[PDB]
């Protein structure tokens, strides 16, 4: 693959927050090892309950966020 696109989707109190980062890659296996932080771009005041999601079409990865403390 040539390009990596990463996103964060979280929905708190009616606000759907989207964070992202784009970077070039050269790897045909899985997510490259390394570190980068994603930044907010979009904030949609949807008021919509989200419990499930689907990706529309190139591999993709899905993880889940947890309320953990980080030192940045």
């Amino acid at each position: 693959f040539k390009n990596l696109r990463e996103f964060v989707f979280k929905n708190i109190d009616g606000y759907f927050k989207i964070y992202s980062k784009h970077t070039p890659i050269n790897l045909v296996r899985d997510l490259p090892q390394g570190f980068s932080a994603l930044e907010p771009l979009v904030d949609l005041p949807i008021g919509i309950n989200i419990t499930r999601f689907q990706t529309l079409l190139a591999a993709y990865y899905v993880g889940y966020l947890q309320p953990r403390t980080f030192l940045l």
């Binding site: 109190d13 009616g14 008021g47 309950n49």
Partner: protein, 35 residues
């Protein structure tokens, strides 16, 4: 929210909406419209 920031403004509509059974009722800012 309990930590709500904002202002609540209200006024009587007895001379506007009253006649009227078109107003229905049963997390913060949760809008459940299921029937």
């Amino acid at each position: 929210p309990d930590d709500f920031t904002g202002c609540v403004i209200a006024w009587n509509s007895n001379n506007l909406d009253s006649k009227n059974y078109n107003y229905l009722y049963r997390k913060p800012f949760e809008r459940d419209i299921s029937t």
